[PDB]
Protein backbone atom coordinates (compact mmCIF):
# COMPACT_ATOMS: atom_id res chain seq x y z
CA UNK A 1 0.00 0.00 0.00
CA UNK A 2 0.65 4.03 -0.21
CA UNK A 3 3.00 5.07 2.48
CA UNK A 4 3.84 9.10 3.36
CA UNK A 5 7.06 10.15 5.19
CA UNK A 6 6.74 13.57 6.61
CA UNK A 7 9.24 16.12 7.04
CA UNK A 8 10.83 16.83 9.42
CA UNK A 9 9.49 14.44 12.03
CA UNK A 10 9.97 16.73 15.11
CA UNK A 11 10.12 20.95 14.59
CA UNK A 12 10.95 23.14 16.98
CA UNK A 13 9.43 26.82 16.47
CA UNK A 14 8.81 29.91 18.19
CA UNK A 15 4.96 31.86 17.96
CA UNK A 16 4.62 33.80 14.59
CA UNK A 17 7.57 31.62 12.18
CA UNK A 18 6.64 30.21 8.62
CA UNK A 19 6.51 26.44 9.41
CA UNK A 20 6.53 23.89 6.28
CA UNK A 21 6.20 20.20 7.31
CA UNK A 22 6.49 17.93 3.83
CA UNK A 23 4.85 14.88 2.53
CA UNK A 24 6.43 12.55 0.52
CA UNK A 25 4.39 9.28 -1.04
CA UNK A 26 5.74 6.48 -1.97
CA UNK A 27 3.67 6.20 -5.20
CA UNK A 28 1.53 8.68 -7.06
CA UNK A 29 -1.55 9.76 -5.77
CA UNK A 30 -4.17 12.15 -6.50
CA UNK A 31 -5.38 14.18 -3.23
CA UNK A 32 -4.02 15.04 0.23
CA UNK A 33 -5.80 16.09 3.41
CA UNK A 34 -4.28 16.97 6.34
CA UNK A 35 -5.38 16.84 10.00
CA UNK A 36 -3.78 18.11 13.41
CA UNK A 37 -3.90 16.41 16.94
CA UNK A 38 -4.13 17.19 20.53
CA UNK A 39 -3.24 15.08 23.26
CA UNK A 40 -6.39 12.73 23.95
CA UNK A 41 -8.61 13.86 21.29
CA UNK A 42 -9.84 12.68 18.10
CA UNK A 43 -8.02 14.73 15.35
CA UNK A 44 -9.66 17.61 13.12
CA UNK A 45 -9.70 18.09 9.66
CA UNK A 46 -7.68 21.28 8.43
CA UNK A 47 -7.27 20.86 4.61
CA UNK A 48 -9.04 18.72 2.33
CA UNK A 49 -8.45 17.72 -1.21
CA UNK A 50 -4.62 18.69 -1.26
CA UNK A 51 -5.02 22.82 -0.71
CA UNK A 52 -9.14 23.56 0.65
CA UNK A 53 -9.65 24.60 3.88
CA UNK A 54 -12.28 23.37 6.29
CA UNK A 55 -14.59 25.53 8.14
CA UNK A 56 -13.51 27.13 10.88
CA UNK A 57 -9.74 26.56 10.32
CA UNK A 58 -7.58 29.98 9.90
CA UNK A 59 -6.24 30.74 6.90
CA UNK A 60 -2.73 30.81 8.38
CA UNK A 61 -2.72 26.70 7.23
CA UNK A 62 -2.12 26.04 3.84
CA UNK A 63 -1.71 23.44 1.69
CA UNK A 64 -0.37 22.57 -2.07
CA UNK A 65 1.47 20.31 -4.29
CA UNK A 66 0.79 16.96 -6.37
CA UNK A 67 2.15 13.27 -7.51
CA UNK A 68 4.26 12.50 -4.61
CA UNK A 69 4.72 15.41 -2.97
CA UNK A 70 2.57 17.53 -1.11
CA UNK A 71 3.26 20.30 2.03
CA UNK A 72 1.75 22.30 4.35
CA UNK A 73 2.73 25.55 5.50
CA UNK A 74 1.51 27.43 8.70
CA UNK A 75 2.95 30.82 7.66
CA UNK A 76 2.36 32.63 11.07
CA UNK A 77 1.99 30.09 14.12
CA UNK A 78 0.01 31.05 16.41
CA UNK A 79 -0.32 29.54 20.13
CA UNK A 80 -3.12 26.86 19.00
CA UNK A 81 -1.14 25.37 16.67
CA UNK A 82 1.73 23.20 18.68
CA UNK A 83 0.03 19.88 18.24
CA UNK A 84 0.50 17.13 15.93
CA UNK A 85 -0.04 17.03 12.26
CA UNK A 86 -0.98 14.60 10.19
CA UNK A 87 -1.48 13.78 6.32
CA UNK A 88 -3.88 11.60 4.98
CA UNK A 89 -4.79 9.90 1.53
CA UNK A 90 -8.11 8.54 0.97
CA UNK A 91 -7.46 7.82 -2.77
CA UNK A 92 -6.97 3.87 -2.20
CA UNK A 93 -7.67 1.05 -0.05
CA UNK A 94 -5.99 1.01 2.04
CA UNK A 95 -6.82 4.67 3.42
CA UNK A 96 -3.26 5.55 4.86
CA UNK A 97 -1.91 8.22 7.10
CA UNK A 98 1.35 10.11 7.11
CA UNK A 99 3.65 9.33 10.09
CA UNK A 100 2.55 12.58 12.25
CA UNK A 101 5.23 15.96 12.49
CA UNK A 102 5.61 16.88 16.39
CA UNK A 103 5.81 20.85 16.40
CA UNK A 104 6.62 22.08 19.78
CA UNK A 105 7.60 25.30 21.70
CA UNK A 106 11.45 26.96 21.31
CA UNK A 107 12.38 29.10 24.08
CA UNK A 108 15.52 29.60 26.52
CA UNK A 109 17.82 26.59 27.99
CA UNK A 110 16.59 25.84 31.49
CA UNK A 111 18.84 23.69 33.89
CA UNK A 112 16.53 20.95 35.77
CA UNK A 113 16.14 20.86 39.48
CA UNK A 114 17.61 17.61 40.54
CA UNK A 115 16.13 15.21 43.47
CA UNK A 116 16.65 11.45 44.35
CA UNK A 117 14.68 9.71 46.48
CA UNK A 118 15.58 6.76 48.44
CA UNK A 119 13.74 3.37 49.04
CA UNK A 120 10.63 3.62 51.84
CA UNK A 121 10.84 1.14 54.63
CA UNK A 122 7.14 0.59 53.79
CA UNK A 123 8.04 -0.87 50.41
CA UNK A 124 11.29 -2.90 51.42
CA UNK A 125 9.03 -4.74 53.74
CA UNK A 126 7.45 -6.65 50.23
CA UNK A 127 11.17 -7.44 48.94
CA UNK A 128 11.35 -4.74 46.22
CA UNK A 129 13.26 -1.78 45.90
CA UNK A 130 12.47 1.45 43.91
CA UNK A 131 14.76 4.24 43.65
CA UNK A 132 13.42 7.14 42.08
CA UNK A 133 15.61 10.45 40.26
CA UNK A 134 13.63 13.75 39.29
CA UNK A 135 14.36 16.40 37.10
CA UNK A 136 12.11 19.06 37.20
CA UNK A 137 10.97 22.01 34.88
CA UNK A 138 13.79 22.15 32.24
CA UNK A 139 14.73 22.91 28.86
CA UNK A 140 15.38 21.15 25.99
CA UNK A 141 14.13 17.65 26.49
CA UNK A 142 17.36 15.97 25.76
CA UNK A 143 19.01 14.91 29.27
CA UNK A 144 21.00 11.99 29.96
CA UNK A 145 20.56 10.05 33.33
CA UNK A 146 23.41 8.00 34.92
CA UNK A 147 22.50 5.72 37.70
CA UNK A 148 25.56 4.73 40.10
CA UNK A 149 25.22 1.77 42.45
CA UNK A 150 28.72 2.34 44.02
CA UNK A 151 30.07 3.51 41.22
CA UNK A 152 28.81 0.84 38.69
CA UNK A 153 27.14 2.43 35.71
CA UNK A 154 23.63 1.17 35.55
CA UNK A 155 22.08 0.04 32.19
CA UNK A 156 18.93 -1.26 31.14
CA UNK A 157 17.52 -2.11 34.79
CA UNK A 158 15.90 1.94 35.53
CA UNK A 159 12.85 3.33 33.50
CA UNK A 160 12.05 7.00 32.89
CA UNK A 161 9.20 8.60 32.10
CA UNK A 162 8.48 12.40 30.79
CA UNK A 163 6.06 15.44 31.17
CA UNK A 164 4.42 16.66 28.06
CA UNK A 165 5.90 20.52 27.39
CA UNK A 166 4.34 22.91 29.99
CA UNK A 167 1.14 24.89 29.06
CA UNK A 168 2.74 28.48 30.82
CA UNK A 169 6.81 27.94 30.26
CA UNK A 170 7.60 25.02 28.18
CA UNK A 171 9.59 22.68 30.50
CA UNK A 172 9.61 19.50 30.81
CA UNK A 173 10.04 17.31 34.25
CA UNK A 174 11.67 13.51 33.89
CA UNK A 175 11.17 10.39 36.67
CA UNK A 176 13.82 7.84 36.19
CA UNK A 177 13.30 5.02 38.57
CA UNK A 178 15.91 1.82 39.74
CA UNK A 179 14.10 -1.19 40.42
CA UNK A 180 15.83 -4.15 42.81
CA UNK A 181 15.19 -7.13 45.15
CA UNK A 182 15.60 -6.18 48.58
CA UNK A 183 18.41 -8.22 49.13
CA UNK A 184 20.52 -7.06 46.20
CA UNK A 185 19.61 -3.04 47.85
CA UNK A 186 20.91 -4.15 50.52
CA UNK A 187 24.67 -5.23 48.62
CA UNK A 188 25.65 -1.68 48.42
CA UNK A 189 25.98 1.37 49.66
CA UNK A 190 26.40 4.48 47.75
CA UNK A 191 22.95 5.24 45.37
CA UNK A 192 23.43 7.74 43.07
CA UNK A 193 21.82 9.97 40.00
CA UNK A 194 24.00 11.57 37.69
CA UNK A 195 22.49 14.24 35.70
CA UNK A 196 23.89 15.09 32.02
CA UNK A 197 21.95 18.44 29.91
CA UNK A 198 23.58 21.39 28.11
CA UNK A 199 22.14 23.94 30.75
CA UNK A 200 24.34 22.35 33.11
CA UNK A 201 28.31 23.18 32.68
CA UNK A 202 29.28 20.01 34.72
CA UNK A 203 27.20 17.20 35.56
CA UNK A 204 24.76 17.53 38.93
CA UNK A 205 25.23 14.17 41.26
CA UNK A 206 22.55 13.70 43.86
CA UNK A 207 23.07 10.79 46.10
CA UNK A 208 22.38 8.87 49.31
CA UNK A 209 23.96 5.94 51.34
CA UNK A 210 21.64 3.51 52.06
CA UNK A 211 20.85 3.94 55.90
CA UNK A 212 19.53 7.29 56.11
CA UNK B 1 -25.52 17.88 16.32
CA UNK B 2 -23.36 15.32 14.69
CA UNK B 3 -22.14 13.33 17.10
CA UNK B 4 -20.66 9.89 17.27
CA UNK B 5 -20.50 8.29 21.12
CA UNK B 6 -18.21 5.17 21.39
CA UNK B 7 -18.48 2.76 24.56
CA UNK B 8 -16.25 2.90 26.91
CA UNK B 9 -12.71 1.24 27.65
CA UNK B 10 -11.80 -2.25 27.74
CA UNK B 11 -9.40 -4.91 29.14
CA UNK B 12 -9.11 -8.27 27.65
CA UNK B 13 -7.51 -11.67 27.85
CA UNK B 14 -5.16 -12.94 25.20
CA UNK B 15 -7.21 -15.11 22.77
CA UNK B 16 -10.26 -13.37 23.77
CA UNK B 17 -12.62 -11.12 21.36
CA UNK B 18 -14.33 -7.62 22.34
CA UNK B 19 -17.28 -5.75 20.75
CA UNK B 20 -17.00 -2.18 20.17
CA UNK B 21 -20.26 0.02 19.34
CA UNK B 22 -20.23 3.87 18.09
CA UNK B 23 -23.97 5.36 18.01
CA UNK B 24 -24.54 8.35 15.68
CA UNK B 25 -27.03 11.42 16.17
CA UNK B 26 -27.17 14.62 13.80
CA UNK B 27 -27.72 13.21 10.39
CA UNK B 28 -29.60 9.81 8.77
CA UNK B 29 -27.81 6.63 9.60
CA UNK B 30 -27.66 4.90 6.16
CA UNK B 31 -26.45 7.82 4.19
CA UNK B 32 -23.39 7.53 5.19
CA UNK B 33 -20.43 4.59 5.11
CA UNK B 34 -18.86 4.32 8.98
CA UNK B 35 -15.37 3.67 9.08
CA UNK B 36 -12.95 2.11 12.35
CA UNK B 37 -9.09 3.30 12.32
CA UNK B 38 -6.80 2.44 15.36
CA UNK B 39 -4.17 4.51 17.18
CA UNK B 40 -2.17 2.82 18.75
CA UNK B 41 1.13 4.32 21.49
CA UNK B 42 3.80 6.18 19.61
CA UNK B 43 0.26 7.27 17.77
CA UNK B 44 0.29 6.00 14.51
CA UNK B 45 -2.98 6.05 12.98
CA UNK B 46 -4.19 3.07 10.66
CA UNK B 47 -7.26 2.69 9.06
CA UNK B 48 -8.78 -0.64 9.48
CA UNK B 49 -12.15 -0.72 7.32
CA UNK B 50 -16.25 0.69 6.75
CA UNK B 51 -19.36 -0.85 7.07
CA UNK B 52 -22.17 0.94 4.83
CA UNK B 53 -25.12 0.29 6.70
CA UNK B 54 -27.70 0.23 3.79
CA UNK B 55 -26.11 -2.81 2.34
CA UNK B 56 -24.57 -4.15 4.62
CA UNK B 57 -21.06 -4.06 2.55
CA UNK B 58 -17.71 -4.03 4.01
CA UNK B 59 -14.02 -3.04 2.94
CA UNK B 60 -11.34 -4.14 4.57
CA UNK B 61 -7.80 -3.27 5.34
CA UNK B 62 -5.66 -6.14 4.38
CA UNK B 63 -3.83 -5.71 7.66
CA UNK B 64 -6.98 -6.32 9.55
CA UNK B 65 -8.53 -8.89 8.05
CA UNK B 66 -7.66 -11.86 10.28
CA UNK B 67 -9.00 -9.08 13.38
CA UNK B 68 -12.17 -7.50 12.91
CA UNK B 69 -15.45 -8.24 11.86
CA UNK B 70 -17.60 -4.83 11.21
CA UNK B 71 -21.50 -4.97 11.29
CA UNK B 72 -24.06 -1.88 11.63
CA UNK B 73 -27.57 -2.07 13.18
CA UNK B 74 -29.82 0.53 11.07
CA UNK B 75 -32.96 0.36 14.12
CA UNK B 76 -30.36 1.77 16.28
CA UNK B 77 -28.06 4.08 14.80
CA UNK B 78 -25.17 2.61 15.98
CA UNK B 79 -21.78 0.36 13.96
CA UNK B 80 -19.99 -2.16 15.76
CA UNK B 81 -16.36 -3.13 15.33
CA UNK B 82 -15.46 -6.72 16.78
CA UNK B 83 -12.16 -7.49 17.35
CA UNK B 84 -11.41 -11.53 17.50
CA UNK B 85 -7.88 -13.47 18.99
CA UNK B 86 -7.04 -10.23 20.73
CA UNK B 87 -3.35 -10.26 21.36
CA UNK B 88 -0.85 -7.45 23.45
CA UNK B 89 -0.54 -5.94 20.23
CA UNK B 90 -3.96 -5.24 19.88
CA UNK B 91 -3.59 -2.47 22.66
CA UNK B 92 -4.85 0.86 21.70
CA UNK B 93 -7.52 3.52 21.11
CA UNK B 94 -10.29 3.02 18.47
CA UNK B 95 -12.19 5.22 16.67
CA UNK B 96 -15.49 5.51 14.62
CA UNK B 97 -15.47 8.28 11.64
CA UNK B 98 -18.37 9.24 9.24
CA UNK B 99 -17.19 8.82 5.67
CA UNK B 100 -18.59 11.40 3.94
CA UNK B 101 -15.66 12.66 2.05
CA UNK B 102 -12.75 12.83 4.57
CA UNK B 103 -13.54 11.98 7.57
CA UNK B 104 -14.95 15.13 9.64
CA UNK B 105 -16.63 13.03 12.39
CA UNK B 106 -15.26 11.05 14.62
CA UNK B 107 -16.35 9.52 18.21
CA UNK B 108 -14.07 10.08 21.26
CA UNK B 109 -11.84 6.83 20.90
CA UNK B 110 -12.42 3.52 22.87
CA UNK B 111 -9.29 2.44 24.85
CA UNK B 112 -9.18 -1.34 24.57
CA UNK B 113 -6.03 -2.92 26.57
CA UNK B 114 -5.30 -6.64 25.98
CA UNK B 115 -2.88 -8.32 28.68
CA UNK B 116 -2.45 -11.95 30.66
CA UNK B 117 -2.64 -9.57 33.67
CA UNK B 118 -5.47 -9.26 36.39
CA UNK B 119 -7.15 -6.23 38.19
CA UNK B 120 -4.98 -5.22 40.87
CA UNK B 121 -4.73 -2.32 43.09
CA UNK B 122 -1.74 -0.01 43.77
CA UNK B 123 0.41 -0.11 46.77
CA UNK B 124 1.51 3.71 47.58
CA UNK B 125 4.81 4.73 48.41
CA UNK B 126 6.16 7.91 49.68
CA UNK B 127 8.42 10.17 47.97
CA UNK B 128 10.38 12.06 50.80
CA UNK B 129 13.48 14.20 50.82
CA UNK B 130 13.65 26.87 49.86
CA UNK B 131 12.28 24.11 48.24
CA UNK B 132 12.03 20.43 48.54
CA UNK B 133 10.06 17.89 46.57
CA UNK B 134 7.88 14.67 47.53
CA UNK B 135 5.04 12.35 46.03
CA UNK B 136 3.99 9.29 45.99
CA UNK B 137 5.14 6.16 43.92
CA UNK B 138 2.10 4.36 42.64
CA UNK B 139 3.40 1.06 42.00
CA UNK B 140 2.20 -2.31 40.76
CA UNK B 141 -1.46 -1.84 39.45
CA UNK B 142 -3.73 -2.93 36.89
CA UNK B 143 -5.18 -1.97 34.37
CA UNK B 144 -4.79 2.74 33.50
CA UNK B 145 -6.04 4.34 34.54
CA UNK B 146 -5.20 6.18 37.99
CA UNK B 147 -5.78 9.70 39.06
CA UNK B 148 -3.30 11.34 41.47
CA UNK B 149 -4.74 14.53 43.47
CA UNK B 150 -2.65 16.39 46.33
CA UNK B 151 -4.50 17.55 49.52
CA UNK B 152 -8.21 16.97 48.24
CA UNK B 153 -7.70 19.27 44.98
CA UNK B 154 -5.70 22.03 47.16
CA UNK B 155 -2.88 21.89 45.75
CA UNK B 156 -1.95 21.62 41.45
CA UNK B 157 0.54 24.22 41.31
CA UNK B 158 4.34 22.36 40.92
CA UNK B 159 2.11 18.99 40.79
CA UNK B 160 3.45 16.57 37.81
CA UNK B 161 1.87 13.42 37.63
CA UNK B 162 4.09 11.22 35.12
CA UNK B 163 2.55 8.76 32.43
CA UNK B 164 2.59 5.21 33.81
CA UNK B 165 5.39 2.82 32.71
CA UNK B 166 4.61 -1.06 31.98
CA UNK B 167 6.83 -3.11 34.35
CA UNK B 168 8.07 -6.54 33.06
CA UNK B 169 5.43 -7.66 35.39
CA UNK B 170 2.52 -6.52 33.27
CA UNK B 171 1.57 -4.24 35.93
CA UNK B 172 1.53 -0.55 35.84
CA UNK B 173 4.19 2.09 37.92
CA UNK B 174 3.70 5.84 38.13
CA UNK B 175 4.92 8.60 40.44
CA UNK B 176 3.35 11.94 41.56
CA UNK B 177 5.09 15.08 43.16
CA UNK B 178 5.26 18.00 43.87
CA UNK B 179 7.60 20.91 45.69
CA UNK B 180 7.02 22.26 48.69
CA UNK B 181 8.83 24.66 51.19
CA UNK B 182 11.43 23.25 53.14
CA UNK B 183 10.39 25.12 56.30
CA UNK B 184 7.54 23.43 56.50
CA UNK B 185 8.57 19.97 56.20
CA UNK B 186 8.31 18.44 59.85
CA UNK B 187 4.65 20.53 60.55
CA UNK B 188 2.60 20.90 56.86
CA UNK B 189 0.61 18.23 55.70
CA UNK B 190 1.01 16.79 52.50
CA UNK B 191 -1.70 13.80 50.87
CA UNK B 192 -1.91 12.09 48.25
CA UNK B 193 -5.12 11.08 47.01
CA UNK B 194 -4.52 8.06 44.63
CA UNK B 195 -8.06 6.33 43.06
CA UNK B 196 -7.69 2.90 40.81
CA UNK B 197 -11.19 3.09 39.99
CA UNK B 198 -10.87 -0.24 38.22
CA UNK B 199 -10.37 -2.32 41.66
CA UNK B 200 -12.37 0.34 43.11
CA UNK B 201 -8.98 1.10 45.31
CA UNK B 202 -8.79 5.00 46.61
CA UNK B 203 -6.21 5.84 49.15
CA UNK B 204 -5.05 9.06 50.90
CA UNK B 205 -1.17 9.09 51.66
CA UNK B 206 0.35 11.53 54.02
CA UNK B 207 3.95 12.20 52.83
CA UNK B 208 7.04 13.04 55.74
CA UNK B 209 10.37 12.86 55.86
Known amino acids: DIQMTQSPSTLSASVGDRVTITCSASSSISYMHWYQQKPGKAPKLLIY???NLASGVPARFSGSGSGTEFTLTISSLQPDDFATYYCHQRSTYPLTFGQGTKVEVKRTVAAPSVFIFPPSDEQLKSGTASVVCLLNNFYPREAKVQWKVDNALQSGNSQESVTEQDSKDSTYSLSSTLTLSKADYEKHKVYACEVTHQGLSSPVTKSFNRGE | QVQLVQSGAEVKKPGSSVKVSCKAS????????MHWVRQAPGQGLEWIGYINPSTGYTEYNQKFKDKATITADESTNTAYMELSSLRSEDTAVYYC?????????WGQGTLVTVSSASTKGPSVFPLAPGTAALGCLVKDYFPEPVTVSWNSGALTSGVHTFPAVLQSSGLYSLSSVVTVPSSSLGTQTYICNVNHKPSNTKVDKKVEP
Open chain 2, 97 to 105: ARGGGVFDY
Open chain 2, 26 to 33: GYTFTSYR
Open chain 1, 49 to 51: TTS
